[PDB]
Amino acid sequence: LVDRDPIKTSFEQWAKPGHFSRTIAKGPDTTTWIWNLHADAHDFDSHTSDLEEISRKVFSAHFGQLSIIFLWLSGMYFHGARFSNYEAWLNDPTHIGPSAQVVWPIVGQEILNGDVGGGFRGIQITSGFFQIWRASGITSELQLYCTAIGALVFAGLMLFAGWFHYHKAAPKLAWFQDVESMLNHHLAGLLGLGSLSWARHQVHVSLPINQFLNAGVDPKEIPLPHEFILNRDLLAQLYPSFAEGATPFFTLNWSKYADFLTFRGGLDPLTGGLWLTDIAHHHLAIAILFLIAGHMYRIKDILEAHKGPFTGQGHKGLYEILTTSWHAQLSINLAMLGSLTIVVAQHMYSMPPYPYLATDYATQLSLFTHHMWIGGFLIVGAAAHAAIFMVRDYDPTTRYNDLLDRVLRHRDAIISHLNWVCIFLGFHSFGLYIHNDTMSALGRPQDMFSDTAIQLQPVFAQWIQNTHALAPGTTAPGATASTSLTWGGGDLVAVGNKVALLPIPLGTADFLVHHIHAFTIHVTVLILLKGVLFARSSRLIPDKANLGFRFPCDGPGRGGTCQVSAWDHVFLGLFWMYNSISVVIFHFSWKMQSDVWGTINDQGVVTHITAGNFAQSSITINGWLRDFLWAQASQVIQSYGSSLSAYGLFFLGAHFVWAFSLMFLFSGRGYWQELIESIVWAHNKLKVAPATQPRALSIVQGRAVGVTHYLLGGIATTWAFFLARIIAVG
Amino acid sequence: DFIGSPTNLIMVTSTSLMLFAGRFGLAPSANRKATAGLKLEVRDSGLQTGDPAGFTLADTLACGVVGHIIGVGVVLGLKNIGAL
Amino acid sequence: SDPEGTGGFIEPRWLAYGEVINGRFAMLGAVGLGKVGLIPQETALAWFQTGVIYNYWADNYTLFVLEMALMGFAEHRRFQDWAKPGSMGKQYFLGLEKGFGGSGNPAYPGGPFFNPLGFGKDEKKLKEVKNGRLAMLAILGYFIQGLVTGVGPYQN
Amino acid sequence: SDPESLRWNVQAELVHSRWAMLGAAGIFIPEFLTKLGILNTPSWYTAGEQEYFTDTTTLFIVELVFIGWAEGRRWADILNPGCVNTDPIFPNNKLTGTDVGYPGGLWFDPLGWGSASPQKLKELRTKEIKNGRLAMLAVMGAWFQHIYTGTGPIDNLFAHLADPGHATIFAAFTPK
Ligand code: CLA
Ligand code: CLA
Ligand SMILES: CC1=C(/C=C/C(C)=C/C=C/C(C)=C/C=C/C=C(C)/C=C/C=C(C)/C=C/C2=C(C)CCCC2(C)C)C(C)(C)CCC1
């Protein structure tokens, strides 16, 4: 193939009918293949038997993405500069209600665009630059318009390095399949030399240029643009030219100092970010590690070492492969990358890291739910791709007899447990709520489960939270309050419209959501675990790995023989996770507003967006539409004719798209065939169809168009439901 | 220069122990874990002899006593010869 | 043909020892004037105190760059042109005597080196004629920022 | 390893290019002879004397009729005979292809030797300036933007601004 091989055509092939699997697209026409090929455009069974390139392709695809983010966000940073909102907001923050983005007025459009601002019509934003942003001190719109093109610079170039691979004559095996350094480098000087470098441009420049912003001015009444070198008088305030120390060390005297740092603990008052000053120290104290750390090392060495009696021989040469699986060294990653994103989602809302967040409610919960769906959308993946390992990747058997070969040894076992785990949960983890209804609708509270009724009695108080703030008995020194303000001990005092941050004390009715999470996190994983484990051969099929991780279903026999596979375990596992996350979101905002998100008022009488309705009334799972869905959402179905309106006006579509999924999810296949011909007939009479044999959806494509829609349906529904109950009161 | 020059002599002190210490601590490696303390090959006591770090913690102390009086509590003496 | 830049293992530093000669006599004007410098208003102001006793009376006009691009042309022409085979110098459109070459394709003191006979006197490998002029180059490099300022020469 | 352009409408692209550039010819000499304004000076009255104007747009329709016919009829025959259907010589229709367009009809034909040609003799005159004119025009048309933009006055429009020091024009010269 042979248009024409090797040596002797530069001449490209566009044309003669084109390619895949060897009874290649037929010649003779079909539809499905147009759906094939976007799908499974890369799988890597095909293109070559021999890994050869592909690692030589996946470096390039990676380059494309890095550019693209860059194309992105130049865009963003643009938008952010020259449709400003920002200059205006910053003198002005805690008045402003901020936009980057504006429509043009054509047809309806422009209901949308409603006064945001330092006096301009806007669409209000809830990702915050304007808060990443506070940091730049120097300011002004045309720069961000430099940071912007600085973006388009990185891109074109960090996108001609992708020419400067695959397409260019390009690289070979050793380079990846000798690993020996790679984390050495990465973590040492970038992980390090960023955070390090970030330190250097995180007190140099930023600290001072918001050290005396947290007062007001009209900027540049404060900051010259370069201003900040050989110079510096200004460091003098924010501290000394080290005055006489030497390269740290000690024969140093302070009668009154210790270098910038000086740790913060708690939140700024009048910018309650948390101190802009533990922010240098912490990043500095990072990098070092990485700076020292990325200095291992070259490998099996450590992995081949420790063994135990249960413990695994396999552990050793736990994978010559690992260097060349790929699909496995992506699956591992996603679990981490993914599980290391939604750990953001907490440390964020219970410890803001940007100036003006919390007061800014809606511009950091959007966040805590966007970052939340990735620390989930990337985890089910982190299973799929292991399934993609577990079936195929190595030519041959020679992994042999380990730790894995071990885990599999039991397998109707690791998943034998985990199962009961879930029905123990569920019964202790949902029908728990249903008690309440059945008995509060029967009505006898004496015996509910209410935080008042079934006795723990009125304290949450001591577990960890109370040991955590309360923190300095300790080898701990530091800082007037907490690591996180929310923890029980301490403080009234945070912020200027509004409440930002307060204990959150829980009790029960934090107790049992916290448990539904368990059962939801667990039966999610059951299906993926048992899915990826039983990947290749099963008690129902042995001849099971033979085409596929995909195949539709083996065949009507054995009783059912349908779902099986593991595309589909990574099809019914998404289906859950959509809840896993979809109900964790439902948790946070009902809390964070029922308690916390606030207002301060004279003598500080806190006024929670809802006076804690949560109390006795989440425990009832109707209260979850009495107090939630039917209570809030009244802002979604009132939202017409306004400015945000695009939410209420989405909330019907996408609350439609979902209720279109079921058609794709719930239906046969030779059905829409049987139909597609009646069609095809009427077509031929007028002479208008045959060519490119119109065909119904590819059993599993149909499932691909379930799910995917069920999610972008059922999801943006709340993306709307949300942005519509924090914009406007809250 | 300054106490800071005494400090130049002193970068030499931290830099020093650590590095001068360094080779011994690596020099027969592939020990991994462990020692004279544990399995096969006793001789008893503790010992007296051999270096890397027995001798330099001592040095931060040396620097200390001489340095010591000079700044201090205006600093002995005590003489005795005075000196005679 | 759609374009060629043959590289073998060290293409670079064939130049490099080259970027270095040019670069090197630019250590240069250091070797043997020295500050644009910056962003040009003075009109009032030097880095941060620069100057004092803005740079310079300063003629200069940035037209360079318009110069950098323009001489760029020469650089890349000498290099193709000699790809070569030479018409090149037309000489006198008519007629007769054209003694004069002037000698050479140059390199060095006689277009053909020339005047071969010489000294009784003055009487008593060519990456070295490179190596030492980075050891003249990277040197002003730090000498731009060559200060400790708050203090000064500890040495001294 | 390099694109393949060659592109194949193409040879046409080059004759399109002649139109653009020879036409580009009218501009330069005449405007610029410009009257080297001028001895002095230039008045229109005359037709347009007071007739409620002359052209506006109507001038454009006449301009086009006169042309439509020409640009139109045209390429329609720079050449092209045979003119139908099924299978390829490739020009892209190619119909003229084998048959010139006619065996025996007429003198479609011009000149000696069963051919179109004026014949061998001359690239000469007109490949170098007329194509050199491909070049010329482009830079001198590139010169036109240079010559107006910056609109001295009237209109900034939408400023992030940040000029003046001084105006732009053509009379000629350059200052500096
Ligand atoms: C405004 C600016 C000023 C500045 C900052 C520069 C800067 C520069 N010019 Mg330049 N130039 C200027 C004014 C300036 N020029 C003016 C007013 C003229 C008109 C004459 C030129 C004409 C000019 C030419 C023709 C070239 C430059 C080149 C250069 C670059 C060469 C780098 C170098 O060190 O070569 C010199 C350093 C060396 C180590 C080379 C040594 C060769 C010497 C011995 C020959 C000249 C000395 C000679 C013996 C003196 C005899 C007198 C003779 C001039 C009549 C450099 C960036 C060159 C370039 O960069 O092209 C790609 C070259 O193109 N300039
Ligand atoms: C870091 C990892 C990342 C990478 C590099 C890959 C790479 C790969 N995955 Mg994969 N995957 C990932 C994360 C990743 N995945 C995650 C997180 C999941 C869990 C959801 C999966 C679940 C998954 C499955 C089930 C499969 C793969 C497969 C593959 C392979 C096929 C790629 C392809 O053809 O594109 C596929 C992309 C398309 C066909 C584009 C369609 C996208 C639609 C669904 C739009 C999404 C909705 C969005 C809102 C629409 C845009 C807006 C619109 C309304 C305007 C490839 C090697 C496939 C394989 O067979 O292995 C060889 C197999 O299908 N992946
Ligand atoms: C040789 C040399 C050198 C070097 C230099 C350089 C070149 C450097 C650097 C620096 C660096 C190299 C830095 C880096 C940094 C990095 C960073 C800082 C990272 C980042 C990133 C980001 C920011 C991202 C984010 C995110 C996330 C979170 C995930 C996803 C999403 C997003 C993307 C947003 C030095 C200096 C010594 C000097 C001398 C010479």
Ligand SMILES: CC1=C(/C=C/C(C)=C/C=C\C(C)=C\C=C\C=C(C)/C=C/C=C(C)/C=C/C2=C(C)CCCC2(C)C)C(C)(C)CCC1
């Ligand atoms: C008549 C007609 C028509 C029709 C129309 C209609 C009727 C429509 C509709 C529609 C509907 C009724 C619905 C839809 C919806 C859609 C959507 C919806 C899309 C998209 C999306 C997006 C862009 C998203 C994003 C996101 C993210 C980022 C992730 C998650 C979240 C969210 C979702 C937010 C047309 C004109 C067309 C054509 C012609 C004919």
Ligand SMILES: CCCCCCCCCCCCO[C@H]1O[C@H](CO)[C@@H](O[C@H]2O[C@H](CO)[C@@H](O)[C@H](O)[C@H]2O)[C@H](O)[C@H]1O
């Ligand atoms: C919501 C249900 C109540 C259950 C928890 C109640 C226990 C703690 C008491 C009230 C908690 C609110 O804490 C709040 O106390 C006071 C309200 O009376 C306010 O008191 C604040 O106002 C005044 C201004 O100088 C002074 O009395 C205080 O020095 C100052 O802290 C504060 O804004 C806040 O620190």
Ligand SMILES: CCCCCCCCCCCCO[C@H]1O[C@H](CO)[C@@H](O[C@H]2O[C@H](CO)[C@@H](O)[C@H](O)[C@H]2O)[C@H](O)[C@H]1O
């Ligand atoms: C080198 C000088 C440039 C050439 C021009 C000078 C005149 C020489 C004749 C060429 C002029 C072109 O026009 C002329 O070409 C022919 C020369 O073969 C003429 O004369 C010839 O025509 C036929 C070829 O075309 C021959 O078979 C005939 O025997 C003869 O009549 C034609 O009647 C006329 O069409």
Ligand SMILES: CC1=C(C/C=C(\C)CCC[C@H](C)CCC[C@@H](C)CCCC(C)C)C(=O)c2ccccc2C1=O
């Ligand atoms: C409804 C449904 C169908 C029928 C769905 C079909 C046929 C969707 C395919 C329709 C395509 C996308 C229309 C494409 C036509 C246009 C793209 C062509 C014109 C181009 C434009 C300019 C409009 C299935 O095939 C199916 C298969 C398996 C399980 C469930 C189901 C299922 O539920």
